[PDB]
Design an enzyme around this catalytic site. Structure first.
Site, PDB file in Angstrom:
ATOM      1  CG  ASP A  53     102.905  30.342  61.585  1.00  0.00           C
ATOM      2  OD1 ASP A  53     102.245  30.141  62.616  1.00  0.00           O
ATOM      3  OD2 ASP A  53     102.745  29.759  60.483  1.00  0.00           O
ATOM      4  CB  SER A  74      94.108  24.975  78.453  1.00  0.00           C
ATOM      5  OG  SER A  74      93.310  25.792  79.273  1.00  0.00           O
TER       6      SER A  74
HETATM    7  O1  LIG Z   1      97.677  26.562  59.306  1.00  0.00           O
HETATM    8  C1  LIG Z   1      98.062  25.699  60.072  1.00  0.00           C
HETATM    9  C2  LIG Z   1      99.153  24.774  59.631  1.00  0.00           C
HETATM   10  C3  LIG Z   1      98.930  23.690  58.782  1.00  0.00           C
HETATM   11  C4  LIG Z   1      99.998  22.916  58.356  1.00  0.00           C
HETATM   12  C5  LIG Z   1     101.277  23.234  58.808  1.00  0.00           C
HETATM   13  C6  LIG Z   1     102.446  22.623  58.333  1.00  0.00           C
HETATM   14  C7  LIG Z   1     103.730  22.772  58.687  1.00  0.00           C
HETATM   15  C8  LIG Z   1     104.489  21.933  57.778  1.00  0.00           C
HETATM   16  C9  LIG Z   1     103.609  21.358  56.957  1.00  0.00           C
HETATM   17  O2  LIG Z   1     102.321  21.762  57.269  1.00  0.00           O
HETATM   18  N1  LIG Z   1     101.537  24.247  59.647  1.00  0.00           N
HETATM   19  C10 LIG Z   1     100.481  25.015  60.022  1.00  0.00           C
HETATM   20  O3  LIG Z   1     100.837  26.133  60.704  1.00  0.00           O
HETATM   21  N2  LIG Z   1      97.648  25.654  61.358  1.00  0.00           N
HETATM   22  C11 LIG Z   1      96.795  26.745  61.830  1.00  0.00           C
HETATM   23  C12 LIG Z   1      95.339  26.666  61.440  1.00  0.00           C
HETATM   24  C13 LIG Z   1      94.784  25.528  60.873  1.00  0.00           C
HETATM   25  C14 LIG Z   1      93.441  25.543  60.541  1.00  0.00           C
HETATM   26  C15 LIG Z   1      92.685  26.661  60.801  1.00  0.00           C
HETATM   27  C16 LIG Z   1      93.305  27.737  61.375  1.00  0.00           C
HETATM   28  N3  LIG Z   1      94.612  27.766  61.695  1.00  0.00           N
HETATM   29  C17 LIG Z   1      98.127  24.655  62.328  1.00  0.00           C
HETATM   30  C18 LIG Z   1      97.077  23.797  62.947  1.00  0.00           C
HETATM   31  C19 LIG Z   1      98.093  23.195  62.030  1.00  0.00           C
END
Ligand SMILES: O=C(c1ccc(-c2ccco2)nc1O)N(Cc1ccccn1)C1CC1
EC number: 3.4.23.22
Length: 330
Positions: A35, A199
């Site tokens: 990821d 982009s």
């Molecule tokens: O799932 C996350 C996501 C959220 C929080 C954190 C994070 C790291 C450490 C604490 O929180 N890390 C992520 O990986 N997405 C992907 C996403 C979001 C919403 C819809 C689809 N895909 C990223 C955008 C922040």
């Protein structure tokens, strides 16, 4: 040093990809979701609440002669889909595709949310964003890539995700046989802890390219491509019968349609996502309404170049002193 591992779609829609990872001594092989949008390596384990484990392979630190409890350390993470997990931490030996890191933080789940339990194919996550997002407390831990970087021949990893097929994660080298043309490199901001880039615009099918800056993250851990509502509206307007459904939670379209391609800019270069990559199939078994692979980011607060976009390219995550991203067609 280098490593090279095959990554495989977990299902017929390419909802996510799993890569085998060897943890501990003797090795315990777990299939992790690599990821680039998070920075924790966490696994289902012998400590996971038993009612929350349903077919996953677990890590058992007590059977590893190299495992050591990281005393006092805990972790807790929530993802943008609402899922979450938490637990304690061990350090252990972790190898990916022949590349070994000793003393890697392996975050052992005590709790996982329902979506994780329900997905028997994912045994944990392997975070590849920047270590500043790592959730371990009170002493934040490094990702597998940060720990390995100094040993690597070149401080890079590459993502080569397949469409309905296996692909590859490489560490420490760029396989020049894996892409066509040249790699175009673009600037990265680490200020939010992500592989965040801009982009240079987009095209829908055979349409003219619109030059417009779109800031977003390269996120192998997200299935779909999430872009501003103006862009997504322009795409789906080209599909007869497509509409945004609040009840479904995004754009749907008639399963009988043939979808147009979507092109995104990387500097002066262009990556074309074939229309078939944007089809995520029936919203429910047997429905003739199909779910779109390009959705609005308006609810999210960031644009996300997820697997739909990344699988159309060979992608270089350059972890040099000034990080950059590279994209090539393939
Ligand atoms: O799932 C996350 C996501 C959220 C929080 C954190 C994070 C790291 C450490 C604490 O929180 N890390 C992520 O990986 N997405 C992907 C996403 C979001 C919403 C819809 C689809 N895909 C990223 C955008 C922040």
């Amino acid at each position: 040093s280098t490593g090279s591992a095959t990554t495989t779609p977990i299902d017929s829609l390419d909802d996510a990809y799993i890569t085998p990872v060897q943890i501990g001594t003797p090795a315990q092989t777990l299939n992790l979701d690599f990821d680039t949008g998070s920075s924790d390596l966490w696994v289902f384990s012998s400590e996971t609440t038993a009612s929350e484990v349903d077919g996953q392979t677990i890590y058992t630190p007590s059977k590893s002669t190299t495992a050591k409890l990281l005393s006092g350390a805990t972790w807790s993470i929530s993802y943008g889909d609402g899922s979450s997990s938490s637990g304690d931490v061990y350090t252990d030996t972790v190898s990916v595709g022949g590349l070994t890191v000793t003393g890697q933080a392996v975050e052992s789940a005590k709790k996982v949310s329902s979506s994780f339990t329900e997905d028997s194919t994912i045994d944990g996550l392997l975070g590849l964003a920047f270590s500043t997002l790592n959730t371990v407390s009170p002493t934040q831990q490094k990702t597998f890539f940060d720990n390995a970087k100094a040993s690597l021949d070149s401080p890079v990893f590459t993502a080569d995700l397949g469409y309905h097929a296996p692909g590859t994660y490489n560490f420490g080298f760029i396989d020049t046989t894996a892409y066509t043309g040249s790699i175009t490199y673009t600037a990265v901001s680490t200020k939010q802890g992500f592989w965040e880039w801009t982009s240079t615009g987009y095209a829908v099918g055979s349409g003219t390219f619109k030059s417009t800056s779109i800031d977003g993250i390269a996120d192998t851990g997200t299935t779909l491509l999430y872009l501003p509502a103006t862009v997504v509206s322009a795409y789906w307007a080209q599909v007869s019968g497509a509409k945004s459904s609040s009840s479904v939670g995004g754009y749907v379209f008639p399963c009988s349609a043939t979808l147009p391609s979507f092109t995104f800019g990387v500097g002066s270069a262009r990556i074309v996502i074939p229309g078939d990559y944007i089809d995520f199939g029936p919203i429910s078994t047997g429905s003739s309404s199909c779910f779109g692979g390009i959705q609005s980011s308006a609810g999210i607060g960031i644009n996300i170049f997820g697997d739909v976009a990344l699988k159309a390219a060979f992608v270089v995550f350059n972890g040099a002193t000034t990080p950059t991203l590279g994209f090539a067609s393939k």
